[PDB]
Design an enzyme around this catalytic site. Structure first.
Site, PDB file in Angstrom:
ATOM      1  N   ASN B  10       0.899  -1.135   0.000  1.00  0.00           N
ATOM      2  CA  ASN B  10       0.000   0.000   0.000  1.00  0.00           C
ATOM      3  C   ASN B  10       0.946   1.195   0.000  1.00  0.00           C
ATOM      4  OD1 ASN B  10      -1.842   1.984   0.265  1.00  0.00           O
ATOM      5  ND2 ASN B  10      -2.761   1.279   2.216  1.00  0.00           N
ATOM      6  N   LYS B  12       0.149   4.175  -0.389  1.00  0.00           N
ATOM      7  CA  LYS B  12      -0.614   5.289   0.165  1.00  0.00           C
ATOM      8  C   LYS B  12      -0.411   6.496  -0.714  1.00  0.00           C
ATOM      9  CE  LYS B  12      -0.541   3.707   4.868  1.00  0.00           C
ATOM     10  NZ  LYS B  12      -0.674   4.187   6.237  1.00  0.00           N
ATOM     11  N   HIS B  94     -10.231   1.261   3.843  1.00  0.00           N
ATOM     12  CA  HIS B  94      -9.060   1.565   4.592  1.00  0.00           C
ATOM     13  C   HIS B  94      -9.332   2.515   5.752  1.00  0.00           C
ATOM     14  CE1 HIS B  94      -5.154   3.007   5.728  1.00  0.00           C
ATOM     15  NE2 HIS B  94      -4.674   1.826   5.282  1.00  0.00           N
ATOM     16  N   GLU B  96      -7.623   4.780   6.983  1.00  0.00           N
ATOM     17  CA  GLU B  96      -7.416   6.225   6.793  1.00  0.00           C
ATOM     18  C   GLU B  96      -8.614   6.904   6.101  1.00  0.00           C
ATOM     19  OE1 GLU B  96      -3.682   5.862   4.768  1.00  0.00           O
ATOM     20  OE2 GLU B  96      -2.607   5.296   6.620  1.00  0.00           O
ATOM     21  N   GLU B 166      -6.830  -4.383  10.326  1.00  0.00           N
ATOM     22  CA  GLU B 166      -5.981  -3.253  10.720  1.00  0.00           C
ATOM     23  C   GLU B 166      -6.080  -2.914  12.217  1.00  0.00           C
ATOM     24  OE1 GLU B 166      -7.679  -0.403   7.851  1.00  0.00           O
ATOM     25  OE2 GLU B 166      -5.518   0.301   7.974  1.00  0.00           O
ATOM     26  N   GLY B 172      -0.049   4.871  15.384  1.00  0.00           N
ATOM     27  CA  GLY B 172       0.058   6.280  15.752  1.00  0.00           C
ATOM     28  C   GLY B 172      -0.319   6.576  17.208  1.00  0.00           C
ATOM     29  N   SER B 212       1.871  -2.811  11.720  1.00  0.00           N
ATOM     30  CA  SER B 212       3.258  -2.459  11.516  1.00  0.00           C
ATOM     31  C   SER B 212       4.088  -3.663  11.221  1.00  0.00           C
ATOM     32  CB  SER B 212       3.911  -1.678  12.629  1.00  0.00           C
ATOM     33  OG  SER B 212       4.148  -0.371  12.155  1.00  0.00           O
TER      34      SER B 212
END
Lengths: 249, 249
Positions: B10, B12, B94, B96, B166, B172, B212
């Site tokens: 990905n 991104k 996704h 995000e 995910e 984060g 990750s």
């Protein structure tokens, strides 16, 4: 005179490699003796093709949106990627993005400032919705929207901006605004600009009409004093577009 | 025994024609001896370059998002458009996208259903946040996420579906997910499928870890029972992706 008009094709979320190529051959064969800047805004997927096949010297390729910085935003395209790819024009604040993808006046203001800073030529879209028009809120809406953009920009920043007036109610509905309505919305925006920015600025500013423009209605709209070109949806997917171009000088 | 794995890059919202073309090179020079499906999800802008250049027999390209139908959606890119362009894989839902772009469970599920209807192989994304996690809502959230996508598919459809879990809580936030935790979220999904859809579907379903992943923790993650590959963020823009593929041996 009037500043150099613009005849921008907004292809939206449509086309095929074949249909689009056709269009492009068409455009490339067209002759345009006068001073006009034509812009073709294709989907990001077809920016390659266009940029390779589009050869007319009077046309430029544009993106239809972007985000300000590269990073973790899956699905999006940023200005940097755009620039690196050779794109210098972009459409920002489109009512469709405002109505369906949460783009508020701030968000728009921001993308525009960012785009300007990265050196792009930006078509910013402003306009009222059916409901606001019906409430008598036209002036407040349009002026607020413009003022949002204005905040983030610096005087010299204006040389890269082109404003697009598009009454949301005229969007892909056939209800084109009359020349009167159009000219009255453009003059208002322009008064604001000379009032807040400078008359030198208001004078060079290109302000486009968007909303059911077609081969037929183009000429009369263009005849208006504060109408400098057009931002075109549907007809832009047709050879009729050529007519639209010819109506501006 | 596990199904064929998948190593999905990905990219991104990043990339430059230069840096990307180099990664591509590296990727093409790679000797992969096992049965693995490598996918490269680039920005829309880079699909062409990507298509032309990747030649590894084990790689396919995918896009980072899409809308179901062509039309008046400025800035957007639809399935038909990707379909004509030769793109057959898509990443959808996704984290995000769900965070900053309004993708509800219902939006992701219709997007998934359309893609499937259209022949695409889809990587559909699910995962809970720190809060849902903190509060004991892990299963409720995850299962709701899977169920929503599932209320629109038929059993035969699942042959086209890939689920990427995910661990949003670990993204984060300062936190770290261990293998045992990846595994627990993964098993949970498998049992729901196995249970609502069918054991046959279940044993065939690929569930990719979307957290990750680096060249160091990949094998130990792959080592876990319900782990079928990864959906890689950051390390996908690095040669390290190569250790990531091998870790699926």
């Amino acid at each position: 005179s009037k500043p150099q008009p613009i005849a921008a094709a907004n292809w939206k979320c449509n086309g095929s490699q074949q249909s689009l190529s056709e269009l492009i051959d068409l455009f490339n064969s067209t002759s345009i003796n006068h001073d006009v800047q034509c812009v073709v805004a294709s989907t990001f997927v077809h920016l390659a093709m266009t940029k390779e096949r589009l050869s007319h010297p009077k046309f430029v390729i544009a993106a239809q949106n972007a985000i300000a910085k590269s990073g973790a935003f899956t699905g999006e395209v940023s200005l940097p990627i755009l620039k690196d790819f050779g794109v210098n024009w972009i459409v920002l604040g489109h009512s469709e993005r405002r109505a369906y993808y949460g783009e508020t006046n701030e968000i728009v203001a921001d993308k525009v400032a960012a785009a300007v800073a990265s050196g792009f030529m930006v078509i910013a879209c402003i306009g009222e919705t059916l409901q606001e028009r019906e409430s008598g809120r036209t002036a407040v809406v349009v002026l607020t929207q413009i003022a949002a953009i204005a905040k983030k920009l610096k005087k010299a920043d204006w040389a890269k901006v082109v404003i697009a007036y598009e009454p949301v109610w005229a969007i892909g509905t056939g209800k084109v605004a009359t020349p009167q309505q159009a000219q009255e919305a453009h003059a208002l925006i322009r008064s604001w600009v000379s009032s807040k920015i400078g008359a030198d600025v208001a004078g060079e500013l290109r302000i486009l009409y968007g909303g059911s423009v077609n081969g037929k209605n183009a000429r009369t709209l263009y005849q208006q004093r504060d109408v400098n070109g057009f931002l075109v949806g549907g007809a832009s997917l047709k050879p009729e577009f050529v007519d639209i171009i010819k109506a501006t000088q």
